[PDB]
Every structure is written in structure tokens, then in C-alpha cells.
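Hey all, quick one. A colleague (J.T.) asked me to put the fe (iii) ion job into the tracker so the inputs and the C-alpha cells live in one place instead of scattered across chat threads. No bug as far as I know, just bookkeeping. Sequence used:
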Amino acid sequence: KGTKTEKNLNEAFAGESMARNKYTYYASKAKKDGYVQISNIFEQTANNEKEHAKLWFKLLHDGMPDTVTNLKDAAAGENFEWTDMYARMAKEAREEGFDDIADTMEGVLAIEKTHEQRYVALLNNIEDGTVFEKAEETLWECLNCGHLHTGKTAPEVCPVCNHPRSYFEVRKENY
Amino acid sequence: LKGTKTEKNLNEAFAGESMARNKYTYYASKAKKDGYVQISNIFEQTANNEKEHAKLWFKLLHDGMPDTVTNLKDAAAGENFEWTDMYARMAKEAREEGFDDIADTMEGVLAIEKTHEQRYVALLNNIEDGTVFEKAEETLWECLNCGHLHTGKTAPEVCPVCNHPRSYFEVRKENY
Amino acid sequence: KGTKTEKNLNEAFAGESMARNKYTYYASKAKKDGYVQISNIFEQTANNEKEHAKLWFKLLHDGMPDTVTNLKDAAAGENFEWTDMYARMAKEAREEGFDDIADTMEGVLAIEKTHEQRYVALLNNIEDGTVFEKAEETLWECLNCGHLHTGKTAPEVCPVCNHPRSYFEVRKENY
Amino acid sequence: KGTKTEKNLNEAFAGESMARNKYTYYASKAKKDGYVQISNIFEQTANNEKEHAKLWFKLLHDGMPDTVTNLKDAAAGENFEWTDMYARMAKEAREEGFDDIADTMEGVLAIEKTHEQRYVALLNNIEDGTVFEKAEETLWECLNCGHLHTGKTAPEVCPVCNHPRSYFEVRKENY
Ligand SMILES: [Fe+3]
Ligand SMILES: [Fe+3]
Ligand SMILES: [Fe+3]
Ligand SMILES: [Fe+3]
Ligand SMILES: [Fe+3]
Ligand SMILES: [Fe+3]
Ligand SMILES: [Fe+3]
Ligand SMILES: [Fe+3]
Ligand SMILES: [Fe+3]
Ligand SMILES: [Fe+3]
Ligand SMILES: [Fe+3]
Ligand SMILES: [Fe+3]
Ligand SMILES: [O]
Ligand SMILES: [O]
Ligand SMILES: [O]
């Protein structure tokens, strides 16, 4: 929009998200310190700030975009994390003596790249129509009840809990 | 540490990562409504990952995790800056440009942050005065774990029902 | 009304509910024992048993009754708890020298008594029509964004987050 | 053992477990019906019932057993579900003409089978010492921060967020 409110909403979206994080950590510390009600108040306040940022976020994007656009924005944001920000952050820390901090910025840098690879893989499934369909028969699992359906395609409706198509994912047994 | 560009950078990555946590929460929400439960769970999974990344930079800027007595003080000052300065400037900045409803929302949020500080200073007052688990007045206490009710000036040392300590006791009110 | 399936359905709801409680304690014990993945497996299994019990519950109740019917049912089973079951269970524990746990059963008995009073008070609020209306000017709180409103009635729509009247409650400030 | 209190606590574990599931369903319906606070109060009461049933559970089981016993007890429970419990109701519902809900009991029966052999797979990982240590080069994921580590054994402490091995699991990428 090129308007001062546009930059204000960006500054308002930040900080409001920083307040959410700060109050989530304070809730965990207050519980360890022996204050359960204070912990709940920190977390109810953390949820209040979560909803304030949603107002500014929905104004900067004219509502809430669809999952295809959301995956495209997240993949571009995570790519910026490990190619620009966390990279440049590590060099400036090493030029000042913060070796240890620089090594931490790079372990987090390696994680954001795995976030983009995951995000691009999910976006490719929507564009290729392979979200609920495989080129070879697989094992599907229902996130609602756990019903297993072997098939080249996912069921339209789960035959147990009657939940729709969205609740089916490729079952993994990583143990 | 302080005065360096690393602080600028250490403070910056705290943002963005905190900003990424909310997007992925909104993105996870929009995913269920679009018909993608796994993509919803993956978005939320990534959000909590970014939640812990920001904790690393937050503890570096605060020399670890401060105690609760300081946490309530910093939270009170953080919300004080919100309603006396931050959201007050954008209220008039948005009104002098035509967005009357955007400033009205910012003014409504400004009043909410004011109640956030008043709530925080009252909780910090209860710790510094020693009135978090004891009143000079006979009050009705409730155990947040099991629901045991206890009448008296002091909260029970241990809940006699579920054997939970004094922390799970708050001052009970019924608001309906 | 008198089929073995009705008992089977009634009995299946009990067993699935016990397993949901069993796996929530197992998840906490595993997370303390040093197994986050095993703790996570215990958690989603309990959610599966929660959905299995939901299938049998909706059959015995012919769908899902509304909140007014659910409140009358919640207050009924709660009255049966502290006037019949836990009272009979306590006197039988004392007849076997189990005085330590008979005091616990009576401690839980008093809690279920308070839960009945909470449930009747809410149902009375729906009947008389004082959920979002009060005879005095009260202070309303938006459970989504935190907006505070003064007056006899809650706002039809929150003027901050634009959420309906359903998110409003009397502010307690219990500290 | 052999006393009426054994049967009473075991009847108290049920019902208390059934009330938590009932109040969980009532909370979801209350939010749809337009009563967020009532939905919160239903949810708050459901957590109270969970801790009441926890008291009766730890009395019957003499405290909280180890994860080894918890996996053995849980696997022995799901086997009962599909070899005896649901196997009986499935044929009892068909003799009375309830074919619509007999297919659901058979579908749930197959799920409890997968629950059993998934529990024994975790148990075998503890008995063989193969929870965090594999004879093959595996890819591990930190369930707290998302750090990836390829290795035969999980990293004693995560080198990014400094969390213990508990938060480490085998990564399977089911998409
Ligand atoms: Fe805010
Ligand atoms: Fe990121
Ligand atoms: Fe299902
Ligand atoms: Fe990150
Ligand atoms: Fe704030
Ligand atoms: Fe208690
Ligand atoms: Fe089940
Ligand atoms: Fe009860
Ligand atoms: Fe609101
Ligand atoms: Fe109870
Ligand atoms: Fe089961
Ligand atoms: Fe980690
Ligand atoms: O905030
Ligand atoms: O179950
Ligand atoms: O109960």
C-alpha cells in the first residue's frame, strides 16, 4: 500500500508475536517456580496476544490465504532463513568473537533448510494431485481413530469414525 | 555482549521466528478448513520448532531464564510501552490517512494491553507482599488439579485429596 | 432398550474411557522416564480411544444432545455420585479398616457436590436467560482477544476481534 | 486384594473415566452451541475427573509403574479388546440385526490389534536396548527443536537446543 499504516502493521505484527513467545516461556517458568495460577494467566495472556497479531496479519494479506499460497509463503520464508539471515548472522558473530553463538545460529540454519524441503514436498503433492493418491499402493492411517486402509488411493470417508478424506495420511512406523 | 551487532542480530532473529510461529499456527488452522489434517499437523509441528529456536535467542539476550519475580516486572513494562506509546502513535497515524476502522481496532487493542499491565502488577504485588497463598481475609481456595475446596486465610500446605502442593491452589471465584 | 447390544455399547463406552485414562497416565510416566516418542505414542492412542468411545456414545444418545440436555445429564450423574456411589463406597471402605482411602473418597465426594452446583448454575443461566444478560451493569471479558465491556448485556459482536457474543463471560479477577 | 474396596475402586475408576469422556464431548458441543465459557467449564471439570480416576488407578496399581510395566500392561489390554471383548460384541450385534454398527465394532477391532503390536514394538525396543541406538546408520530428529543427526546412536544431548536424548526419535517422512 506504500502507507505508514502498512509499516505500522508490520511493526505491530512483530512484538505481538514476540509477546506471545515471552509469555509462553514465562508460563513454564512460573509453573516450575510454584505458581500454577500465574502460569495460566501468562498463557491466557499469550493467547490474547496471539489473537491480536491475527488482526494485523489478516489486514496485511486481505484475509487468510489458502493452503497453496500459505505453503508458498512459508517455503520462501524458510529459504530466506538459511540462505540470508542465519548465514549473515553467523559471520557477524564470528567477526566479534562469538564462536559459540555462531555455531548455534548454524545448527538452527540447518533446521530451516529441512523446513523448506518439507514445505516444498507438501506443495508438490497438492499441485501434482498426489496429496491423497500414490502412484503405488500404500498404507493409509486415520488421524481420528487409527483405521488402516491399504490402497493406491485414500478413502473418501473413513469406514469407522465416518470422518472425511482429510484425516488420512501415509502411515509411518519409525520405531 | 551489549552494544554489538550480534545483539542487533540476536534481537532480530527473536522476531521473525516469533513471527513464523504465529503464521504456522494460522497456516495450520487454514489447513484443516482446506481439508489437509497432516499439513495442518506439520505446520503446527514447525511452529513449535520455531518456538524453541526463539527461546535460544531469548535466553542469550536475558542471560538464561529469569525468575518469575523479574518476569512479571518485564512483562508489566512491556505492556506499559504498548498502550502509552506504541499503539498510541499508530492510532493517530492511521486516522490521519483515512483508515478510521484500523485505528479503532488499534485503540481497542490498546485498552487490552492496559489491563494486561494492571493484571501483571497485581500478581507481582502478591509475591512481594506474600499474599499469593495467604490472605488476611478468610477466603475460599480451590485446587486446580482436582477441585478440592478449602476455606480459610491460608492455602493448604498439601491438597488432602490429590496430594498436590500449594502451587495448585488459587482464590476461587464463580463468574456467572 | 433391552438388547445385549445396548449393554455391549454401554460397556464398550466404559472400557474405551478407561483406556483413554490409562494411556494419558502412561504418556506422562514415559515422558518422565526419558521417552518422548513413546510418550507421544501413548497420547495419540488415548485420543483414538477417545474417538472410539465417541462412536458408542453417539449411538446410545441418538446423536449428540444440545448443551441444555447435556447440562441436565451432567448434573444428574453428578448428583448420583455424591449422594449414592461415593457415599456407599466410603462406608464400605471403613468396614474393612481402609480409613485412609475412605477419607479420599469423601474428599472426592465433596468435589462432585460442587460440580453439581456449577452445572445447575449454568443451566439456570440458560433457562432464565441470564447467560449474556444481567440485572446489574457488569464487566464482560472476551475470551478470544481480552476486550473488556461494561454494561448489563454482553456485546452482540466483539468490536476488537469481531467474534460473536459466545466468547464473552463475566470477568472474575481472582487474585 | 479380594476385598469389596478392590471392586469399588475399580468401579470408581470407571464412570470417573466415563465422565471425562462425556464432559469432553459436552465441551465440543457447547462451543458449537455458542457457549465458550460453558465449554471451558465442561473442559475444566473433565480435567478434574481425570485426576480423581488417577487416584483410584494408582491405588489399585500401587503407585505408578515403570514404562516397561506400562507397555506390558497396555499391550495385554488391547489384546483383550480384539481377541475377546469386541470379538464377542461383533457377533452379538449381528445375531440381533444391527449390521450397521456391527461393521464398526469389527473396524474398531482391527484398530486395537494395531495398537497391541505397536506397543510390543516399543517394548521390544526397550528390552533390546534399541530405542536410541541402532545397528544401522539411521537419521534421528530432535522432537523439541527439529535438529537432524545421522548416526548409529542418538546424540547424548542435542547440540542445538541442549535437550536430552529423550526428545530424539527415528525420522520417517511419510509424505
Ligand atoms: Fe497485543
Ligand atoms: Fe523458520
Ligand atoms: Fe477413522
Ligand atoms: Fe527457526
Ligand atoms: Fe501486550
Ligand atoms: Fe487437589
Ligand atoms: Fe478403542
Ligand atoms: Fe464426578
Ligand atoms: Fe474479542
Ligand atoms: Fe470425580
Ligand atoms: Fe483400546
Ligand atoms: Fe534439539
Ligand atoms: O503484545
Ligand atoms: O480402548
Ligand atoms: O466423578
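Adding what we noticed when we looked at it: The interface with chain B takes residues 103-104, 107-108, 110-111, 114-115, 118, 121-122, 125, 131, 145-148, 159-160, 169-175 of chain C (CB under 8 Å). The longest helix of chain C spans residues 4-33.
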